[PDB]
């Protein structure tokens, strides 16, 4: 689903377009990051202008997973791509605008800005 | 195999 050494697109525009996973938080040998799982990431392909360059390491929250997950309620959410947003260290993201939908499960993790600047939450 | 050295 989402695991080590995974390249994915960037839902917001801090300067980066393609981002690779480097490790997944939680206990040892997590090997699977779900929606809302903080992940250490690196930038691979990025536009020149912005506040980031190619080489830095940041922390990100996944907002889109192609496989999806069976929610506690019973409904299932799916995607056709993989999107992530970047944060500095706090729940507040660095991004100025978030493109595309964001999962509702993130409400259970904080990050109120993600809900606040979403085009429409699924 | 062989050649135990």
């Amino acid at each position: 689903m989402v695991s080590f050494m995974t390249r994915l697109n960037v839902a917001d525009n801090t300067g980066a377009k393609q981002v690779g996973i480097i490790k997944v938080l939680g206990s040892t040998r997590k090997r699977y990051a779900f929606l809302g799982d903080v992940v250490v990431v690196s930038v691979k392909d990025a536009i020149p202008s912005g506040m980031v360059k190619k080489g830095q390491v940041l922390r990100a929250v996944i907002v889109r997973t192609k496989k999806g997950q069976q929610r506690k309620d019973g409904t299932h959410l799916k995607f056709d791509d993989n999107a992530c947003v970047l944060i500095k260290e706090d729940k507040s993201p660095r991004g100025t605008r978030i493109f595309g939908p964001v999962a509702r499960e993130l409400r259970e993790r904080g990050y109120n800005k993600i809900l606040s600047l979403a085009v429409e939450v699924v | 195999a062989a050649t135990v050295v």
């Binding site: 409904t75 959410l77 799916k78 056709d80 085009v119 | -």
Partner: protein
């Protein structure tokens, strides 16, 4: 002893709704879900098109797909589910009960309506 396996359907008749119409594989439908951030309930509107329809009871579930800002979104809906409103808007013609080719088609990805 002796049974008929209709007890599966017998313990079932306590949770069905009889207002769901018929819609097979390629129709444009809308669904609303009740979200509870607080005792104030919010009515999420979810338009889309039928992708699959399969089940043997409460397991009867369908798939709704929408597109927004170039990104497509999939969802599974249980036909028999409280706080779920199901309506039919447009009917089309498809030759497959489940359509899988839609996952890689956007742009003139539409079904001619039924005649």
């Amino acid at each position: 002893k002796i049974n008929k396996q209709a007890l599966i359907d017998l313990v079932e008749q306590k949770q069905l709704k009889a207002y769901v119409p018929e819609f097979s594989a390629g129709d444009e439908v809308n669904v609303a879900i009740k979200l509870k951030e607080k005792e104030k309930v919010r009515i999420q509107n979810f338009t889309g098109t039928v992708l699959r329809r399969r089940g043997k009871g409460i397991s009867e579930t369908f798939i709704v797909r929408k597109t927004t800002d170039g990104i497509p979104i999939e969802k599974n809906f249980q036909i028999h589910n409280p706080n779920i409103s199901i309506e039919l808007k447009r009917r089309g013609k498809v030759r497959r009960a489940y359509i899988s080719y839609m996952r890689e088609r956007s742009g003139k990805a539409a079904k001619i309506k039924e005649r």
